[PDB]
């Protein structure tokens, strides 16, 4: 669907870090590890929360209805 | 579906009192108090503070079922020492320690940067 | 009383919100309807994982 | 002062790394529990949807709005809707903020938390404002609209406790560690060969003295030094997170004391 | 009442004794419009 607003485990906000993350992958050409590290996701639960997520809404917006 | 309301964990129900003091029939000069709408957060602290009182023979809390937010606290003090006074002294001690801790944290915070 | 009831009831055990209602004729020219109801389910004690 | 002591090792807008000295284990644990759950915070509790032609479901979006971190600075001069003598909600208990989004450009139109507009009267109280720790200043990515998709709704935010729902959680993860050298022996380390080489050494080990093999086990020692790191989400500043944590614990103890005071009635 | 077609952005108001099809389209897939009476959501 869309990037989860907050991490399930701890509760840290991660929804505001999605686009940025993507930028860190395509703009600065970083690996996922460093990209996640720069966003302040030290605990691997949030790190998971962003790395593991699949943005499905971008495929959902392809329909006209 | 059959899940209870969330506020039932901290909001007292209809007729439910906060503390239920009951004379213990087992050992003499003992008491069992039922704390409603409270969990380990309060029980563990109070029980641990009751053990500091050297005029308290016994002090133990327990949560009979995790479904219900409540816990029983058994206190046994020496003769000539009402257990309610032990509970009150424990509570006031807790409050004083927390106040001092708060003040110290506040003074230590003002000396920081960034 | 010149009519018999043929109304469709919501599931006795279920509940939710009417997500979308579809009205369309059939191949034989029969007006038929599909009503989709949406219900968000939250993991409860007893859910299989 | 005279009782427990604090030593702020690190401090920031989001985190506070400190050391609690002269404290019982139960008090530190209880403080942690209070900081995690029992702290008043403002968050979206009610959502009224007018038009929603976006991909996401109604209660989906609603759930996403519920987790939005709102300003809870002057939350203590706000009131619970259950306590307020009004109907449903008012300006003394709740903060109402609207949301009107519509697909304009051919490209994807993003709907953030900044798009939330406060409608109710705040009357001088620093409250309701959605926290934006974002660098671009957008905030939480709420939804995505196509070209003709429209999202029109209203949000009534009410004072709540994280014990009722984690959306009212003022803090994220709280780091907690006592006795890094296991001198109390509260933990029997699992191993295959060498117990010390396999298990990583904690940072807090730099703040205590290592055990001597010539010395026996100290059986009369308890737990005094506690290493904590409190992290806030944004709704309430860290210092105020631990401070209002302390105040909440103290207050709910005072409620029990008051109950004892009241049970003396015939 | 009123309806809205599936594969186009129209807004039909054809009640009973009308139904199919659509205005300036040709397809018979008609959906029903959202209610005016709003519903609340406990954002949890
Ligand atoms: Zn996390
Ligand atoms: Zn009110
Ligand atoms: Zn059409």
Swiss-Prot record, chain A:
There is a cross-link at residue 59 (Glycyl lysine isopeptide (Lys-Gly) (interchain with G-Cter in ubiquitin)). GO terms for biological process: nucleolar large rRNA transcription by RNA polymerase I; ribosome biogenesis; RNA-templated transcription; termination of RNA polymerase I transcription; termination of RNA polymerase III transcription; transcription by RNA polymerase I; transcription by RNA polymerase II; transcription by RNA polymerase III. GO terms for molecular function: DNA binding; DNA-directed RNA polymerase activity; zinc ion binding. Pfam families: RNA_pol_N (PF01194). Keywords: DNA-directed RNA polymerase, Isopeptide bond, Metal-binding, Nucleus, Ribosome biogenesis, Transcription, Ubl conjugation, Zinc. PROSITE patterns: RNA_POL_N_8KD (PS01112). Its main location: nucleus. GO terms for cellular component: nucleoplasm; nucleus; RNA polymerase I complex; RNA polymerase II, core complex; RNA polymerase III complex. It is found in: Nucleus, Nucleolus. Zn(2+) binds at residues 7, 10, 45-46. Belongs to the archaeal Rpo10/eukaryotic RPB10 RNA polymerase subunit family. NCBIfam families: PRK04016.1. Present with 5300 molecules/cell in log phase SD medium. This is DNA-directed RNA polymerases I, II, and III subunit RPABC5. It comes from Saccharomyces cerevisiae (strain ATCC 204508 / S288c).
Curated annotation (Swiss-Prot), chain B:
It is found in: Nucleus. It holds the Pfam family RNA_pol_L_2. InterPro entries: RBP11, RBP11-like, RBP11-like_dimer, RNA_pol_Rpb11_13-16kDa_CS, Rpo11-like. Its main location: nucleus. Keywords: DNA-directed RNA polymerase, Nucleus, Transcription. Changing residue 114 to P: Transcript termination readthrough. One of its GO terms (molecular function) is DNA-directed RNA polymerase activity. One of its GO terms (biological process) is transcription by RNA polymerase II. GO terms for cellular component: nucleus; RNA polymerase II, core complex. Changing residue 111 to P: Transcript termination readthrough. Gene3D superfamilies: RNA polymerase, RBP11-like subunit. Belongs to the archaeal Rpo11/eukaryotic RPB11/RPC19 RNA polymerase subunit family. Component of the RNA polymerase II (Pol II) complex consisting of 12 subunits. PANTHER family: DNA-DIRECTED RNA POLYMERASE I,II,III, DNA-DIRECTED RNA POLYMERASE II SUBUNIT RPB11. Present with 4280 molecules/cell in log phase SD medium. DNA-dependent RNA polymerase catalyzes the transcription of DNA into RNA using the four ribonucleoside triphosphates as substrates. Component of RNA polymerase II which synthesizes mRNA precursors and many functional non-coding RNAs. Pol II is the central component of the basal RNA polymerase II transcription machinery. It is composed of mobile elements that move relative to each other. RPB11 is part of the core element with the central large cleft. Seems to be involved transcript termination. This is DNA-directed RNA polymerase II subunit RPB11. The gene is RPB11.
From Swiss-Prot, chain D:
GO terms for cellular component: nucleoplasm; nucleus; RNA polymerase II, core complex. It comes from the Eukaryota. Keywords: Acetylation, DNA-directed RNA polymerase, Metal-binding, Nucleus, Transcription, Zinc. It is found in: Nucleus. The keyword Cell wall biogenesis/degradation does not apply. One of its GO terms (biological process) is transcription by RNA polymerase II. Signal peptide: none annotated. One of its GO terms (molecular function) is DNA-directed RNA polymerase activity. Changing residue 28 to D: In mutant RPB3-1. The keyword DNA-binding does not apply. Zn(2+) binds at residues 84, 86, 90, 93. Present with 10000 molecules/cell in log phase SD medium. Belongs to the archaeal Rpo3/eukaryotic RPB3 RNA polymerase subunit family. DNA-dependent RNA polymerase catalyzes the transcription of DNA into RNA using the four ribonucleoside triphosphates as substrates. Component of RNA polymerase II which synthesizes mRNA precursors and many functional non-coding RNAs. Pol II is the central component of the basal RNA polymerase II transcription machinery. It is composed of mobile elements that move relative to each other. RPB3 is part of the core element with the central large cleft and the clamp element that moves to open and close the cleft. Seems to be involved in transcription termination. Component of the RNA polymerase II (Pol II) complex consisting of 12 subunits. This is DNA-directed RNA polymerase II subunit RPB3. It comes from Saccharomyces cerevisiae (strain ATCC 204508 / S288c).
Curated annotation (Swiss-Prot), chain E:
A zinc finger (C4-type) spans 5-25. Keywords: DNA-directed RNA polymerase, Metal-binding, Nucleus, Peroxisome, Ribosome biogenesis, Transcription, Zinc, Zinc-finger. Zn(2+) binds at residues 5, 8, 22, 25. One of its GO terms (molecular function) is zinc ion binding. It comes from the Eukaryota. The keyword Transcription applies. One of its GO terms (biological process) is nucleolar large rRNA transcription by RNA polymerase I. The N-terminus is blocked. GO terms for cellular component: cytoplasm; nucleolus; nucleoplasm; nucleus; peroxisome; RNA polymerase I complex; RNA polymerase II, core complex; RNA polymerase III complex. It is found in: Nucleus, Nucleolus; Peroxisome. Belongs to the archaeal Rpo12/eukaryotic RPC10 RNA polymerase subunit family. Present with 907 molecules/cell in log phase SD medium. DNA-dependent RNA polymerases catalyze the transcription of DNA into RNA using the four ribonucleoside triphosphates as substrates. Common component of RNA polymerases I, II and III which synthesize ribosomal RNA precursors, mRNA precursors and many functional non-coding RNAs, and a small RNAs, such as 5S rRNA and tRNAs, respectively. RNA polymerases are composed of mobile elements that move relative to each other. In Pol II, the core element with the central large cleft comprises RPB3, RBP10, RPB11, RPB12 and regions of RPB1 and RPB2 forming the active center. This is DNA-directed RNA polymerases I, II, and III subunit RPABC4.
């Amino acid at each position: 669907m869309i990037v989860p607003v907050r991490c399930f485990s701890c509760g840290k906000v991660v929804g505001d870090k999605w686009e940025s993350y993507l930028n860190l992958l395509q703009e600065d050409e970083l690996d996922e590890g460093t990209a996640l590290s720069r966003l302040g996701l030290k605990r691997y639960c949030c790190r998971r929360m962003i790395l593991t997520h699949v943005d499905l809404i971008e495929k959902f917006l392809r329909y006209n209805p | 579906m059959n899940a209870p309301d969330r506020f039932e964990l901290f909001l007292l129900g209809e007729g439910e009192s906060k503390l239920k003091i009951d004379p213990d029939t087992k050992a003499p000069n003992a008491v069992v108090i039922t704390f409603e709408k409270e969990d380990h957060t309060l029980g563990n602290l109070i029980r641990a503070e009751l053990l500091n009182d050297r005029k308290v023979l016994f002090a133990a809390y327990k949560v009979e079922h995790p479904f219900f937010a409540r816990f029983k606290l058994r206190i046994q003090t020496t003769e000539g020492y009402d257990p309610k006074d032990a509970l009150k002294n424990a509570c006031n001690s807790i409050i004083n320690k927390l106040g001092a801790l708060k003040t110290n944290f506040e003074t230590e915070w003002n000396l920081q940067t960034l | 009383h010149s009519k018999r009831d043929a109304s469709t009831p919501l599931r006795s055990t279920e509940n939710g919100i009417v997500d979308q209602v579809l009205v369309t004729t059939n191949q034989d020219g029969l007006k038929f309807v599909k009503v989709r109801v949406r219900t968000t389910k939250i993991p409860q004690i007893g859910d299989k994982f | 002062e005279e009782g427990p002591q604090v030593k702020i090792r690190e401090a920031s807008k989001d985190n506070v790394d400190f050391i609690l000295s002269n404290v019982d284990l139960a008090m530190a644990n209880s403080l942690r529990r209070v900081m995690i759950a029992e702290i008043p915070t403002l968050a979206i509790d009610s959502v009224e949807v007018e038009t929603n032609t976006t991909v996401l479901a109604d209660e989906f979006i609603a759930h996403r709005l519920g987790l939005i971190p709102l300003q809870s600075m002057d939350i203590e001069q706000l009131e619970y809707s259950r306590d307020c003598f009004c109907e449903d909600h008012c300006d003394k208990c709740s903060v109402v903020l609207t949301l009107q989004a519509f697909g304009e450009s051919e490209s994807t139109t993003n709907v953030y938390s900044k798009d939330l507009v406060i409608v109710s009267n705040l009357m001088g109280r620093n409250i309701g404002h959605p926290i934006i720790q974002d660098k671009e200043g957008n905030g939480v990515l709420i939804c995505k609209l196509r070209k003709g998709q429209e999202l029109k709704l209203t949000c009534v935010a009410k004072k709540g406790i994280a014990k009722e729902h984690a959306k009212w959680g003022p803090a994220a993860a709280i780091e907690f560690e006592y006795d890094p050298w296991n001198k109390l022996k509260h933990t029997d380390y699992w191993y295959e060969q060498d117990s010390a080489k396999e298990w990583p050494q904690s940072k807090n080990c730099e703040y205590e003295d290592p055990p001597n093999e010539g010395d026996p086990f100290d059986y009369k020692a308890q737990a005094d030094t506690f290493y904590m790191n409190v992290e806030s989400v944004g709704s309430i500043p860290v210092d105020q997170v631990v401070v209002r944590g302390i105040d909440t614990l103290q207050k709910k103890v005072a409620s029990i004391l008051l109950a004892l005071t009241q049970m003396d009635q015939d | 009442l009123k309806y809205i077609c599936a594969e186009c952005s129209s807004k039909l108001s054809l009640s009973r004794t009308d139904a199919v099809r659509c205005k300036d389209c040709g397809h018979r897939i008609l959906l029903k419009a959202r209610t005016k009476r709003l519903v609340q959501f406990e954002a949890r």
